[PDB]
Structure formats: C-alpha cells, structure tokens
C-alpha cells in the first residue's frame, strides 16, 4: 500500500505515466483501437496477447513485469443510459480488484467511456464518481490522466472537495 493513499490528476499521455501499473481504456476485442487504447498499444504491444474481455470487466496482461489492466467501459452509442451506467460502474469495480490482486502501490487510470464511447455526452462527473466508488477502499496512489485543460481543473476540484 502507499503510506498515505492519495488521488492526483495529470494532463499528459498515460503512456508516459510514473506509476507501477496502467489501466487501458480497452475495446472488448483486444484491438489496437484509437485514443488512450492506441497510445497503450504503441507503448506496451505485448500486453495485447489474449487481452479480449467483455464490457464491464478488466483483464490484466503483463508487458515484461509491468501490468496493463484492460478495462472495457460501455459504448453509450449502443447501451441505454441505465445499462451503460451499470456496466461503467462494474468496469471500475473490476479495476479495483485487479489493482488489489497485483499488490501495486500506484496506478495510472483514464476516465472510462468519456471519449469515443461517450455517445457524444460530457461524462466527466459520471465516470469520475464511479472511479471513486471503486478505488476509495484500495490503498494504491491513484493518478488520473486527462488531455483537456478544463477537465484537469474540474478533476482537481472534485479531488480537493473531498479534501
Ligand atoms: C491521457 N489520455 C490519452 N493518452 C494517450 C492518448 C490520448 C489520445 C486521445 C485522448 C486522450 C489520450
Ligand atoms: Cl504528454
Ligand atoms: Cl472512451
Ligand atoms: Cl480529457
């Protein structure tokens, strides 16, 4: 565990993280994909061996000794708001199980279902709150990665609000 488990946010490419493991915003088929998934494929391509897994689950594959946790959020183009919300919460619960099993002291995590799987909606609050629900009972240092300057400010404010 980290000696004082914390949440932080960084605005940078998650492929350049400084944590002991990474969560991929994966597709169910283990394909290279686009966005976070393509950057993860370029950095850790070995981790895509038998990485395919259903929506709402996470599957870890080692790149050397570095763990890549493939977490499959729902595509809100295809899911109803209600079923989508359930699967998005479940994907994060499976990430917390993996992070705990691996015994890491830190994890780099993107906001699942906020990019091409968002169904064209702003899902910052929805995705972040499901992230907190899952990860609050873990003792890893969590570092959330984002691209957008306004998202960095909103994520920082939400972390600081809890103190
Ligand atoms: C931290 N997030 C990201 N990491 C890598 C590539 C990305 C491409 C598009 C959007 C976000 C990206
Ligand atoms: Cl960067
Ligand atoms: Cl996405
Ligand atoms: Cl972003």
Swiss-Prot record:
Subcellular location, record wording: Host cytoplasmic vesicle membrane
Domain Macro: 4-163
Coiled coil: none
Modification comment: Phosphorylated by host on serines and threonines.
Effect listed in the UniProt record for changing residue 117 to V/W: Almost complete loss of mono-ADP-ribosylhydrolase activity
Binding site for ADP-D-ribose: 13, 27, 35, 115-117
Domain of life: Viruses
Membrane topology qualifier: Peripheral membrane protein
Function description: Seems to be essential for minus-strand RNAs and subgenomic 26S mRNAs synthesis. Displays mono-ADP-ribosylhydrolase activity. ADP-ribosylation is a post-translational modification that controls various processes of the host cell and the virus probably needs to revert it for optimal viral replication. Binds proteins of G3BP family and sequesters them into the viral RNA replication complexes thereby inhibiting the formation of host stress granules on viral mRNAs.
Domain-related comment: In the N-terminus, the macro domain displays a mono-ADP-ribosylhydrolase activity. The central part called, the alphavirus unique domain (AUD) has a zinc-binding function. The C-terminus region, also called hypervariable domain (HVD), is mainly disordered and binds several host proteins. This intrinsically disordered domain contains 2 SH3 domain-binding sites and 2 FGDF motifs necessary and sufficient for the formation of nsP3/G3BP complexes.
Subunit relationships: Interacts with mRNA-capping enzyme nsP1. Interacts (via C-terminus) with host G3BP1; this interaction inhibits the formation of host stress granules on viral mRNAs and the nsp3-G3BP1 complexes bind viral RNAs and probably orchestrate the assembly of viral replication complexes. Interacts (via C-terminus) with host G3BP2; this interaction inhibits the formation of host stress granules on viral mRNAs and the nsp3-G3BP2 complexes bind viral RNAs and probably orchestrate the assembly of viral replication complexes. Interacts (via C-terminus) with host NAP1L1.
The protein's name in its UniProt record: Non-structural protein 3
Species the sequence originates in: Chikungunya virus (strain S27-African prototype)
């Amino acid at each position: 565990g980290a000696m004082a488990p914390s949440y932080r946010v960084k605005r940078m490419d998650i492929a350049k993280n400084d944590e002991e493991c990474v969560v991929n915003a994966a597709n169910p088929r283990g394909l290279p994909g686009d966005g976070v998934c393509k950057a993860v494929y370029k950095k850790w391509p070995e981790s895509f061996k038998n990485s395919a897994t259903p929506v709402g689950t996470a599957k870890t594959v080692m790149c050397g000794t570095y763990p890549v946790i493939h977490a499959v959020g729902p595509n809100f183009s295809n899911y109803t708001e209600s079923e989508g919300d359930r699967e998005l919460a479940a994907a994060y619960r499976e990430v917390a199980k993996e992070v705990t099993r691996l015994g890491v002291n830190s994890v780099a995590i993107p906001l699942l279902s906020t990019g091409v799987y968002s169904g064209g909606k702003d899902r910052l609050t929805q995705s972040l709150n499901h992230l907190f629900t899952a990860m609050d009972s873990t003792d890893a240092d969590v570092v959330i990665y984002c691209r957008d300057k306004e998202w960095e400010k909103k994520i920082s404010e939400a972390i600081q609000m809890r103190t």
